[PDB]
Design a protein around this ligand. Sequence first.
Ligand SMILES: CC(=O)N[C@@H]1[C@@H](O)[C@H](O[C@@H]2O[C@H](CO)[C@@H](O[C@@H]3O[C@H](CO)[C@@H](O)[C@H](O)[C@H]3NC(C)=O)[C@H](O)[C@H]2NC(C)=O)[C@@H](CO)O[C@H]1O
Length: 32
Amino acid sequence: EQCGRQAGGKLCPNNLCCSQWGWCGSTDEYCS
Ligand SMILES: CC(=O)N[C@@H]1[C@@H](O)[C@H](O[C@@H]2O[C@H](CO)[C@@H](O[C@@H]3O[C@H](CO)[C@@H](O)[C@H](O)[C@H]3NC(C)=O)[C@H](O)[C@H]2NC(C)=O)[C@@H](CO)O[C@H]1O
């Protein structure tokens, strides 16, 4: 994926959250 464990620990741009599955968001599905 793009971020988190399923990307090997990358983070997200500007200010957004990173989903439990590993993608960027800033919404609950992507902060939880
Ligand atoms: C309950 C569960 O975990 N079921 C498994 C599936 O989740 C898994 O596929 C993954 O699904 C998620 C959710 O649809 C995918 O995330 C989304 O991926 C798109 C890719 O275009 C991304 O743009 C979205 O932002 C992102 N959403 C979120 C909330 O992060 C994820 O990429 C899938 N990963 C993979 C490697 O397939 C399937 C396998 O396909 O298995 C289920 O057991």
